XYZ file of C-alpha atoms in Angstrom:
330
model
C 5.472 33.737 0.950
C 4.933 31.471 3.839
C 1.283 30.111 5.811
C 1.023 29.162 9.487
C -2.004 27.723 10.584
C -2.913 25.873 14.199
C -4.594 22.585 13.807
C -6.712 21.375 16.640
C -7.612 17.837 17.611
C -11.565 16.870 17.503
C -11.633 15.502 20.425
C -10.141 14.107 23.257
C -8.822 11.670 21.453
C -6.630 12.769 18.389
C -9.589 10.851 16.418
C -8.616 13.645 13.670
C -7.575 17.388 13.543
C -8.992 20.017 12.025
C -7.444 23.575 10.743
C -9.262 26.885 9.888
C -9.228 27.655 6.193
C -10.713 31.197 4.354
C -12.590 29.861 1.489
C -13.846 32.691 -0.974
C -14.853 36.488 -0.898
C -15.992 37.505 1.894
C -14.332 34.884 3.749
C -16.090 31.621 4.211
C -14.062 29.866 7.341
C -14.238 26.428 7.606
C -12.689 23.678 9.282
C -10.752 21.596 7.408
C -8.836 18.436 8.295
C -5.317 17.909 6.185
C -4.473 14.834 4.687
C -0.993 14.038 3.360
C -2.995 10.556 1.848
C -5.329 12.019 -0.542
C -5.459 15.357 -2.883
C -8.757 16.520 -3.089
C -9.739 19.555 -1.599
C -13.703 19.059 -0.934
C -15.804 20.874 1.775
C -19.378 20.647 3.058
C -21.405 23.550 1.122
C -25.185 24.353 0.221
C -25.275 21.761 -2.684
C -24.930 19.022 -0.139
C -27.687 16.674 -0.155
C -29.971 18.625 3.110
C -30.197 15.149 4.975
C -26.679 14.772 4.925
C -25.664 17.748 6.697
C -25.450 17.670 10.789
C -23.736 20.716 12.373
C -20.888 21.268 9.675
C -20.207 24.703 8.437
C -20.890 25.074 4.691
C -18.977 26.584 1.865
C -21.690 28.949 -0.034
C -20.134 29.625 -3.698
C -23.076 31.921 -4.752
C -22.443 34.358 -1.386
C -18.708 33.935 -2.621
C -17.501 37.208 -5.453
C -14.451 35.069 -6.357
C -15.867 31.938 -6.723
C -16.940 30.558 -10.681
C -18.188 26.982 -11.243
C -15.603 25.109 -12.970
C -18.016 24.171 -15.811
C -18.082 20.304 -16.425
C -15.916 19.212 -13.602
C -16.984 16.535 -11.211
C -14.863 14.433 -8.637
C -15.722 11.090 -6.101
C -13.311 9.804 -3.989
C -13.490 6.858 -1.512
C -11.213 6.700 0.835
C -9.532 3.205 2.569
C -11.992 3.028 5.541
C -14.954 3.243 3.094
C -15.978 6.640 3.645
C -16.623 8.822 0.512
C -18.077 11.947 -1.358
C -18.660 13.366 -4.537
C -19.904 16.516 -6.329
C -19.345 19.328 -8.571
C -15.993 22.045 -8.630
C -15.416 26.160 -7.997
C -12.246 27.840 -8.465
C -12.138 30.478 -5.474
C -9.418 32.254 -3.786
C -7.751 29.904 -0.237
C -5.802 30.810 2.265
C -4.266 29.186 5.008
C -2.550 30.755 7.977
C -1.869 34.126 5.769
C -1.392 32.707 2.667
C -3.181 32.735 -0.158
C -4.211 30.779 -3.481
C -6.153 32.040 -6.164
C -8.050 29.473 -8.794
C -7.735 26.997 -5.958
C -9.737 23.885 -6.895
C -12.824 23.991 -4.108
C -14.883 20.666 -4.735
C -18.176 20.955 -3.356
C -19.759 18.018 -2.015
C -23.172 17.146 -3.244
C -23.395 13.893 -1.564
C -20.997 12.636 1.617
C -21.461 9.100 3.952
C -22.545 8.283 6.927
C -19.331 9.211 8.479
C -18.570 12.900 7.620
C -22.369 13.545 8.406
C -22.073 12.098 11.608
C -19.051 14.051 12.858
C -20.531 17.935 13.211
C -16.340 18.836 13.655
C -15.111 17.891 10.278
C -16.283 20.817 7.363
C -14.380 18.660 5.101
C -10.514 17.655 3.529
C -7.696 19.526 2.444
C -5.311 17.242 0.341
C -2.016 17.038 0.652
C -0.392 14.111 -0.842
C 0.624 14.484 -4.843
C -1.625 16.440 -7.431
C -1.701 12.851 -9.636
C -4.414 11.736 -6.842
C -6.992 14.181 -7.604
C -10.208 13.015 -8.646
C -11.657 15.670 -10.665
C -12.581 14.789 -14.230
C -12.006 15.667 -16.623
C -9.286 17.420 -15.764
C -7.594 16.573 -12.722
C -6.903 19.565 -10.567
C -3.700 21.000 -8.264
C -3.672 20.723 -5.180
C -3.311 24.036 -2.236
C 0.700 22.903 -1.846
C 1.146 22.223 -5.614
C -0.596 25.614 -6.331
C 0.979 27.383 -3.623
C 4.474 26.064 -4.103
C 6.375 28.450 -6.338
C 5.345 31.317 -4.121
C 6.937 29.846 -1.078
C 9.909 31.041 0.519
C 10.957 26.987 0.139
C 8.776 24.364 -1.599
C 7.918 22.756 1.951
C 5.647 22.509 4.036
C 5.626 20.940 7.785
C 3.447 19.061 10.136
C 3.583 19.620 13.814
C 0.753 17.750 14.925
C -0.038 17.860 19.162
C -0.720 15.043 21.730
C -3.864 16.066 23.037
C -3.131 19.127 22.170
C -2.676 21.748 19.351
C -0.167 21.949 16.947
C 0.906 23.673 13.561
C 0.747 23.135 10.061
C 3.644 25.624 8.336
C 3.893 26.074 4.785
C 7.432 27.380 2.963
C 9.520 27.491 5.681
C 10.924 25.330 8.469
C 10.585 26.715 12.109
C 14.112 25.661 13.876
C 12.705 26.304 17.109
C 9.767 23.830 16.922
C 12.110 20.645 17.426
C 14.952 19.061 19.436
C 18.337 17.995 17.645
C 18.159 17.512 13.709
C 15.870 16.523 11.071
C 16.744 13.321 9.287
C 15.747 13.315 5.708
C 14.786 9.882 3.604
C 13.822 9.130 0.246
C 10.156 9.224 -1.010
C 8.860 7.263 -3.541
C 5.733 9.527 -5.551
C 4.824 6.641 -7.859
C 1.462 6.067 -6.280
C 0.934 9.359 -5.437
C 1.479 9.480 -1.626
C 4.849 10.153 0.776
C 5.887 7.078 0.371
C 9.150 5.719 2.579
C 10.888 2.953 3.828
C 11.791 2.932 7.792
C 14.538 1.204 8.902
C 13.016 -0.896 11.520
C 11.286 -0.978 15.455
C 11.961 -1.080 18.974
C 8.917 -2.459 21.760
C 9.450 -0.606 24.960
C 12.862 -1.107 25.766
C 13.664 -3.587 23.709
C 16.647 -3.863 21.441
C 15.996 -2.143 17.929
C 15.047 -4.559 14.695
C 16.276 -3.513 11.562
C 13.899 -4.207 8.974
C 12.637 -1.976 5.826
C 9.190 -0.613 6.111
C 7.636 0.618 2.937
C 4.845 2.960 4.364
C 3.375 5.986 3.769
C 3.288 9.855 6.163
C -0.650 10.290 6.137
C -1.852 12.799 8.748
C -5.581 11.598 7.464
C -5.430 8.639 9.262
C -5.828 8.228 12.687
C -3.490 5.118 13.607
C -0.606 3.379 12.874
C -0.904 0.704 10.582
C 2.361 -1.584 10.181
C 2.780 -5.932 9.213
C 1.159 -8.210 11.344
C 4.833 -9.336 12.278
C 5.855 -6.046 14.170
C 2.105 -5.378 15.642
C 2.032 -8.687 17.303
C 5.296 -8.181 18.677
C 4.291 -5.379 20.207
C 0.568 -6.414 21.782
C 2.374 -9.286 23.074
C 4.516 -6.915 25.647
C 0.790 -6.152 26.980
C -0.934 -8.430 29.723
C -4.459 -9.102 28.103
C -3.987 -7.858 24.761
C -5.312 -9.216 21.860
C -6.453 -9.265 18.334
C -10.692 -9.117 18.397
C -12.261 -9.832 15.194
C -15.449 -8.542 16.621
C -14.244 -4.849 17.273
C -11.672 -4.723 14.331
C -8.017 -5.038 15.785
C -6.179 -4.952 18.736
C -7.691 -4.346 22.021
C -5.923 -4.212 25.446
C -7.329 -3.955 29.460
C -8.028 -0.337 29.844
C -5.692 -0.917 33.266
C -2.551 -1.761 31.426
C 0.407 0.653 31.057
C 1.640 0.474 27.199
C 4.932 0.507 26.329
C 6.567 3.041 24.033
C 7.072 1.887 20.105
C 10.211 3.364 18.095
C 10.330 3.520 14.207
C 13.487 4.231 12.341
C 14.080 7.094 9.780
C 17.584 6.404 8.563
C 20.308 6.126 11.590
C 17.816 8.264 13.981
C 14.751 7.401 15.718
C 11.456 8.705 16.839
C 10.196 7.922 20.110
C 5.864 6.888 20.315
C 5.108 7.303 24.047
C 3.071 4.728 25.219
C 0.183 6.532 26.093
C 0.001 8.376 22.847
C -1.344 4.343 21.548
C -4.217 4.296 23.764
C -7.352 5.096 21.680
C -9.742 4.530 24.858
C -13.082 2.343 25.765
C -13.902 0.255 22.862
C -17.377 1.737 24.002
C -18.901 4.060 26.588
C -17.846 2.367 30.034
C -16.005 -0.676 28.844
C -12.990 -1.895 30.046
C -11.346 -3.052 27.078
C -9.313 -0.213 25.114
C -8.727 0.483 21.620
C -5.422 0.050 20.592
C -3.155 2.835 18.675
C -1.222 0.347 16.712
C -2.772 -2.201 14.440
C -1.957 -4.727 11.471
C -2.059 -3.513 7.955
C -2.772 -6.619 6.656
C -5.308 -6.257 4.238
C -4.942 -2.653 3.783
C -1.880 -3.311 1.031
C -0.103 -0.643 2.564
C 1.957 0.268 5.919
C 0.446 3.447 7.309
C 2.481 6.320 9.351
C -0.691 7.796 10.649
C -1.162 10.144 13.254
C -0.102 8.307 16.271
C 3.658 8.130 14.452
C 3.271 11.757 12.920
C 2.727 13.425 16.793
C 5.581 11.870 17.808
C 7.508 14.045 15.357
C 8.738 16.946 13.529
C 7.660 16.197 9.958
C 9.517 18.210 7.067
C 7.222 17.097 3.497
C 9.912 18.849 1.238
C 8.021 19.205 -2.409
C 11.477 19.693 -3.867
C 11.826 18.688 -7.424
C 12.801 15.277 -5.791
C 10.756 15.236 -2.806
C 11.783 13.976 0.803
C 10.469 13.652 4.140
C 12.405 14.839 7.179
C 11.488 13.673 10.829
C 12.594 15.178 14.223
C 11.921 14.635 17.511
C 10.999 17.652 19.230
């Protein structure tokens, strides 16, 4: 079997994308945004606390034939920007782009923050990084990739994600038209649970290439890219005006600069960032100071390949017995 499923960015600025997903019998559609960084599958539904629902669409188990309560099961997450939810579990049947799961996990938030309440777009996560993540107690749960996996035509699944624009989430297959050249494969590491994998160093602009190992991790959850302190500054200092504001939390830049591309290493190749794809826009409504796409993970205790790397790319997550992580250009 294979899936093949548009994802769509919130808004106009790539804050986060979200894909449709058929929760349930009848169908329940919601919108779902994937992260390789976590593994819980959890959606809005009508046990959430009343208050904390704005505009989301809700997952209703009891209007759902296929859906049981997975009796005594519970889950919480937080994730690393300090957002969280929690609540009880279903089994029901998912699909994704045409294919389908039954006895899927469905975690069904009781109580969310601030955060997912406050974005109407987001109906809740789909999680895609390894099933050891999960949160569920007391028995962890599988995730839709881990459940889905021996089905697939190939135990893959890609991420095509768009600047400013749609892209494509594929699942058992690998769609040779959808990049330029080849895919260059590298090593993960699983043993805390995400796509862990060392890049082989950066270029600034036009600057000559550093070669340097970068442990980080492929998380289409997260929004930016988060890299040492070392390789951030070097960047922000090829930028008139830029700098580090412990009031708005990072780097910020003059909203009239032109940014310079950034290029990571996977193995001998190299993806291309565009500089434009690092502007994140007014730091508020009218200002002229901008946001900036690439900031230190210092702090965070890991290097994070977030979206602003992942768009620049093909991205093969190959769930082979030893798993790997392929990147074109495209």
């Amino acid at each position: 079997s294979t899936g093949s499923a548009t994802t769509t960015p919130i808004d106009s600025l790539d804050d986060a994308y979200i894909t449709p997903v058929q929760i349930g019998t009848p169908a329940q559609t919601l919108n779902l945004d994937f992260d390789t960084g976590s593994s819980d599958l959890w959606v809005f539904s009508s046990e959430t606390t009343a208050s904390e629902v704005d505009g989301q669409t809700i997952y209703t188990p009891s209007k759902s034939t296929t859906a049981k309560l997975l009796s005594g099961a519970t889950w919480s997450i937080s994730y690393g920007d300090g957002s969280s939810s929690s609540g009880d579990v279903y089994t029901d049947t998912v699909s994704v782009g045409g294919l389908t799961v039954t006895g899927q996990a469905v975690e069904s938030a009781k109580k969310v923050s601030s955060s997912f309440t406050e974005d109407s777009t987001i109906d809740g996560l789909l999680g895609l990084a390894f099933s050891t993540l999960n949160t569920v107690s007391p028995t962890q749960q599988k995730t839709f990739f881990d459940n889905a996996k021996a089905s697939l035509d190939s135990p893959v699944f890609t991420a095509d994600l768009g600047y400013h624009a749609p892209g494509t989430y594929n699942f058992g297959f690998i769609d040779t038209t959808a990049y330029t050249g080849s895919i260059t494969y590298t090593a993960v590491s699983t043993k805390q649970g995400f796509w862990e994998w060392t890049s082989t160093g950066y270029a600034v602009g036009s600057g000559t290439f550093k070669s340097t190992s970068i442990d980080g991790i492929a998380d289409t959850g997260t929004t930016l890219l988060y890299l040492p302190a070392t390789v951030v500054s070097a960047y922000w200092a090829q930028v008139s005006g830029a700098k580090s504001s412990s009031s708005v939390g990072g780097y910020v830049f003059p909203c009239s600069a032109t940014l310079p591309s950034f290029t990571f290493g996977v193995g001998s190749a190299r993806i291309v960032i565009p500089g434009d794809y690092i502007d994140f826009g007014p730091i508020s409504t009218g200002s002229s100071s901008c946001f900036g796409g690439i900031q230190s993970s210092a702090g965070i205790g890991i290097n994070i390949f977030g979206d602003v790397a992942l768009k620049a790319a093909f991205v093969v997550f190959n769930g082979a017995t030893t798993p790997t992580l392929g990147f074109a250009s495209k």
